[PDB]
Paper text:
The crescents are covered by a protein scaffold that is primarily comprised of the D13 protein. This protein has no predicted trans-membrane domain and requires the N-terminal region of the A17 integral membrane protein to form a honeycomb lattice on the external surface of crescents and IVs. The crystal structure of vaccinia virus D13 reveals a double-barrel organization that consists of two jellyrolls (J1 and J2) decorated by another β-sandwich forming the head domain. D13 forms a trimer with a marked pseudo-hexagonal shape resulting from a parallel arrangement of J1 and J2.
We determined the crystal structure of both native D13 and D13D513G. The two models only differ in minor loop movements although several loops could not be modeled in the native D13 structure because of its lower resolution. The two structures have an r.m.s.d. of 0.5 Å for all equivalent atoms.
Numbering used by the authors:
A (entry chain A), B (entry chain A), C (entry chain A): 32 to 44, 52 to 81, 85 to 219, 225 to 352, 355 to 479, 502 to 535
């Protein structure tokens, strides 16, 4: 045999179609989709932008579909491949939130991303390769709306960007100029919103079953206070959020601070430095405060309650130190002691100002609210951005009416992670199927309780080729 | 066959026993121990807390022990498995040193850790699995005292914590409902304190020999000035230590600083900014110093000598810059130029104030001394927390009376690390055995010279199954 | 068989020769070269110092060369082996730029580095090992001048260091006391300076072809403004550079700042804080400025042009905030907003002050210019230190007169990286050969346009053993 890297352009309908047929292409594998990202001008991309574009991939012959996959499941299959993820687009250039100051300003420079479309034909290189029995093979890529792969504020003219944006793809593969086999086709079932059950029918020969949760943000405008950009650690998310709150939390002003809702409770800090918000004490000490000015603490920046308990973000701070700058008229914060977590950074702004909330909700300045970001990432899992919180308390799997498997702790996720050497595993059973979960309880007084959930069940069926 | 994840509770005696016997469990492998950590309340856990709990693991049948291992050797076998180590417990939640301010305050939230008990039955999955010849298999886990897995200060009521703490384990394994083999059983020999020799008797069929050193802290109270928490890099250890010394090293005071031992030599910094401690010059410059106050340098914060040479921590600083805060009455340090290393951060406080020391030793404030931490981690290697310093100068291995192997440089550690793709290797010979080492010399005037050492020799014997 | 780690000293001629012959050494593999680095005294090493020493390695028998490799190609073959690279020497101890203040001061402590000499005899351990047919095997290591592995300033007495420095090597290997095979011998061709073509003649049986670019710094003194040391990320390089410029960029002075060339345009910052450099606005605001002093902005710190466009480093800054220190008489910079990139940090100082430049070029203080570093790393790729910029726009490969392969985008680099699980791949064709590239265009007004390029083509030929 002789291998060759072959690249094809395709027809755009957003859906891209690529036709493979050549007297010398006997076999093929290792599909890679290229995407040309445009120059973005005017007044950031999600991490792994290339994978997030993909809605669905289908491989077909004259006899029909040979193999197909949902975009999220392809991404899940490549999540433990750092190289493939880097090629997708993961950089400060693509993923940091850039700002356009003038209508002619360049926000993002043009770039190319590469999406490794992992197929069952790559497992054993030439041995597993797709053979083309003088057949025409069609590769069909369905794209997600560009709204899903972009993080932006209200100021950005998304309407025009959406109208003008076009997917520019190219398909590459390793062709080979040169026995029956088996292939596993992933099948996905999504449960009804908040329903802790899902069923996979016609299970006759399954190699594995995976169970996970996705948040549903349909009851929101998909706006979040902060986003850390390229820096994706749990701490980066928390630091970006604390940073966004600080300029409204501690104010150096000549008289009571203006520009805040009437619902805002901004209190002058005593000589002591301690402000008491019920049971919580906040120690605030700012250096170089001008003589005509005082230090103020916003005691209800974000507040939620269903006369009952109050989830107050201002109460999550215990110490705030800094120095006022006479030159820039800002407080330059130094050390901050808080108890902010990954869940707080994952609360949509809509849930703070929801109908269930008896309070205003959001007592930030208009300047802070204008800086909020629309995040529509299509592959979010759990109830937080890092999928850190495990919300499944118990899992039961039934084969027919009999209990096939049951667990409390995620011991099936621990084994998945150990056996596949992955740090991003799911509750998986490796070998009809009915899945029932018991969700963990977060307070009814926590805004996160109101994030909608969807149960996802993935089944891999065995097929003869 | 058909695999199944089976979980068992066990009997507590601290020793946990788990009995495996089922007409359908034909074979098993991949043992995982779960541990429920309690809520810690009142006025941090070691990294890889789950592995550090284990004292010994034994697998037995009616015919006796099939396989057994010392806790440290199990940990050593899993040290290159990042996933297994993460599952053990390695997070900011578990490993950062948290503070309890009131008797009802929550220091640590409850959590579950998972310990992968790597056995010779996992190497080739089903091919290497332990077969149960209608036999009852007993798994016995011996636990370390909780004192070993916890990092705390004097203020923490350890007495009550120890009395109330209980190990809550559960054993999981992959069971299989379905020829003679060979297995390697690790055997460990620990030399006499400071003795540079150790012998393994009855060596007939060994697959490998490993040699390493452990510090012995019996001549101390196991108290250290600092600990970096979850951040475990060499730099994190050094930064945590420098940070702890700084508030006693440079003092902004109205008149000579009070609250220090009479042995303390606190000198006013000249207009020049340079203080000379013998041959060492320390440049100290603090901004916003009040008119009624002066800048002072502690010239003997920690001092050790056996009229001879002096190991002085204050002499390890060349430049200290900062700004005094009128609001908090503290110096907010900016840039620090020092020559502090990993060894300095690994010196037990006991060795500064030892009988060999002709000086007081420890001239820190009572506030600083109260913040010291008890560290009893059972798996420490070398003479520093990172096992960075190689203290073996030469190694000789004898098979009977003949020299089997000898080396100066750790070329056997370099090969171990290259061949096993590990960054945490030991001097290893891969294939009676007498090991003799020559230890490197650190100054007799260095407190670290007085850290006791133990030679550890691990031998893997071949057994027929 | 029985394996043994054998170490040999060798003869120094710089060229080291090692002779292997023993009645009991039947086979061998896994060559490791040890190097003793000396104590460096007076008034930093390149990362992977051990690999950068090697110019060439040759393995010979009585019948001639068995296998040989160029130092850069050995390094390229080991670039995806983190362990081997660490052993080479990659630490803060070796790679941070240390300073000697007195002629008796220790800049670097002595150390040992280990260079894994990867050979085709290591692929399948004993199966691929080199068999010694009662033959004498000679290993010849040719070393690079020490000038290549050292990063230093003008103050360092390199002349004396070079005269006194000696390579102290030792060769280790795994010997074994105990059918025809095939081995791939790498062959490298370097094109003429700036020539976008290269040819490999006598190609009869090649397993692969790799193509990459190297900068040629012969038209320079090999001096760069900054180097980040051990911290090697793109951001570390950028931060080190910004940091070096800042003290000349914003000056707090009593009257117009002195000590700058007459070509320097240092402007007083208005009360507004905004300085306009043509189309670019720089916001500069410094706190605690003494009453007798003003804030100045260097508006042409580094300037390049061929009455035309100007590449001005001062125009790459949009916001500079800080606080003046009365104690140290320095500005302590806080937040900086700039558009500095990896290319700016990779510009040799010679290109700023080149004949093509109609401007002075370099309007920094003498203090800043004295801090410049000589970097002679022999394995640099592309036109920047991180090899981030892809300067090949199109690649064409011809086998005879026929086009074997052609590409625009680096799809052959993407496949190399995916198939070899490497994040440091090259445009590679895996299976006479003529390579032609089209280089991308950077502005003629950019100093980087004048960095000389060399096309490198690597061919692996099949040999029978």
């Amino acid at each position: 045999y002789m291998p060759q890297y072959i690249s094809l352009s395709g027809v755009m309908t957003a859906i891209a179609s690529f036709e493979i047929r050549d007297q010398y292409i006997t076999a093929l594998n290792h599909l890679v989709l290229s995407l040309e990202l445009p120059e973005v001008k005017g007044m950031g991309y999600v991490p792994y932008v290339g994978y997030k574009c993909i809605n669905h991939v289908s491989i077909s012959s004259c006899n029909g579909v040979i193999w197909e996959i949902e975009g999220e499941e392809l991404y899940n299959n490549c999540i433990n491949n750092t190289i493939a993820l880097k090629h997708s687009g993961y950089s400060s250039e693509l993923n940091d939130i850039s700002i356009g100051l003038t209508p002619n300003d360049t926000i993002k420079e043009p770039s190319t991303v590469y999406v490794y479309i992992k197929t069952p034909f790559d497992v054993e290189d030439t041995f597993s390769s797709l053979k083309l029995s003088d057949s025409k093979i069609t590769v069909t890529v369905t794209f997600n709306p560009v709204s899903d792969i972009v993080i932006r504020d209200s100021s950005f003219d998304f309407e025009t960007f959406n109208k003008e944006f076009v997917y520019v793809p190219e398909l590459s593969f390793i062709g080979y100029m040169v026995k029956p086999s088996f292939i596993e086709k992933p099948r996905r079932v999504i449960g009804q919103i908040n329903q802790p059950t899902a069923t996979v029918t016609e299970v006759h020969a399954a190699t594995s079953l995976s169970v996970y949760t996705k948040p549903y943000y349909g009851n929101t405008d998909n706006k979040f206070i902060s986003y850390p950009g390229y820096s994706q650690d749990e701490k980066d998310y928390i630091d970006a959020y604390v940073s966004r709150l600080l300029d409204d939390l501690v104010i150096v002003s000549d008289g009571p601070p203006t520009g805040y809702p009437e619902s805002a409770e901004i209190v002058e800090v005593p000589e002591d430095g301690i402000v008491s918000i019920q049971d919580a004490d906040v120690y605030v000490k700012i250096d170089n405060v001008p003589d005509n000015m005082s230090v103020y603490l916003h005691t209800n920046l974000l507040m939620f309650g269903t006369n009952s308990f109050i989830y107050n973000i201002s109460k999550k701070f215990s110490a705030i130190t800094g120095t006022y700058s006479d030159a820039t008229k800002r407080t330059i914060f130094a050390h901050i002691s808080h108890s902010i977590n990954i869940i707080d950074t994952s609360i949509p702004v809509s849930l703070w100002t929801s109908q269930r909330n008896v309070y205003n909700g959001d007592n930030r300045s208009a300047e802070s609210k204008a800086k909020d970001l629309f995040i529509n990432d299509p592959f979010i899992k759990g109830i937080d951005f890092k999928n850190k919180t495990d919300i499944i308390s118990r899992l039961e799997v039934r084969f027919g009416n009999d209990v096939l498997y049951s667990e409390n702790g995620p011991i099936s996720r621990i084994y998945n992670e150990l056996l596949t050497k992955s740090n991003n595993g799911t509750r998986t059973l490796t070998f009809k199927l009915s899945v029932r979960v018991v969700y963990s309880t977060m307070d009814v007084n926590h805004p996160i309780y109101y994030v909608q959930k969807q149960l996802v069940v993935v089944c891999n069926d065995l097929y003869k080729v």
